[PDB]
């Protein structure tokens, strides 16, 4: 979750 995960992919 979080911004960490948003580095690898940003959710639909």
């Amino acid at each position, epitope marked *: 979750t979080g911004w*960490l*995960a948003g*580095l*690898f*992919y*940003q*959710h*639909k």
Partner: antibody
Framework: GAEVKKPGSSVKVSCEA???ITWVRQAPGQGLEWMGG????????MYAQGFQGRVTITADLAYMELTNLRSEDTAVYYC????????????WGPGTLVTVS | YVLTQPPSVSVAPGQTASITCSGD??????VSWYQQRPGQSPVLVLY???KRPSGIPERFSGSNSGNTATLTISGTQAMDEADYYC?????????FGGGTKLTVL
């Protein structure tokens, strides 16, 4: 581009370290399987599931190291690169065949 | 998280091929597609369900709904022979479909 490792040995696959680095392997007859990822600007490494904890992701070049090789680890290993925050990889490096026996 | 694809599709030159990729509420995720010609590194042919990188012709197109994403290739050429893999992210894990082997003959 093709290497032969003995059982129980180790292999390191290195990749050039705004982009996301990902390591993928293609085992004969098993499609592609993620091994983990690395984001150079944030130094964040994600680990994939299913390698019994024998993957290490490090950077000085970033490196994916797989220890305690067995015949099931025979596969083509790729570096791949993609844009930050976009979950896809638009550049795949040349594969490296690793033959364990 | 599991993504399933048909293992093989076999089509004559010129006709349209569809390759499906299914997973639990996959329609709610961005799906990317890769073309791997035999003996070669994969190439990105679709991202974000339906967008084509530069160099990928408009005869490649994609859709994504319910539990299935679909890659559609019209006017199939011999050079389209390849393994096609869908990918998606679930819970900070990257997942690949099992790949579909496309034969043009």
């Amino acid at each position: 581009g093709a290497e032969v490792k003995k059982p129980g040995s180790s292999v390191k696959v290195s990749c050039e370290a705004n982009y996301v680095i990902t390591w993928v392997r293609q085992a004969p007859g098993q499609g592609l399987e993620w091994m983990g990822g690395f984001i150079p600007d944030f130094r964040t490494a994600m680990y994939a599931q299913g390698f019994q904890g024998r993957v290490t992701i490090t950077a000085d070049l970033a490196y994916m190291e797989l220890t305690n090789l067995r015949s099931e680890d025979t596969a083509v290993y790729y570096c791949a690169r993609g844009p930050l925050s976009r979950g896809y990889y638009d550049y795949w490096g040349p594969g490296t065949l690793v033959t364990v026996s | 998280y599991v993504l399933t694809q048909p293992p093989s599709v076999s089509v004559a030159p010129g006709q349209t091929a569809s390759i499906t990729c299914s997973g639990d509420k996959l329609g709610d995720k961005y799906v990317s597609w890769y073309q791997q010609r035999p003996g070669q590194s994969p190439v990105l042919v679709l991202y974000q369900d339906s967008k084509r990188p530069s160099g990928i012709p408009e005869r490649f197109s994609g859709s994504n709904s319910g539990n299935t994403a679909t890659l559609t290739i019209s006017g199939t050429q011999a050079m389209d022979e390849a393994d096609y893999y869908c990918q998606a992210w679930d819970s900070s894990a990257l997942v690949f479909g099992g790949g579909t082997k496309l034969t043009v003959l």
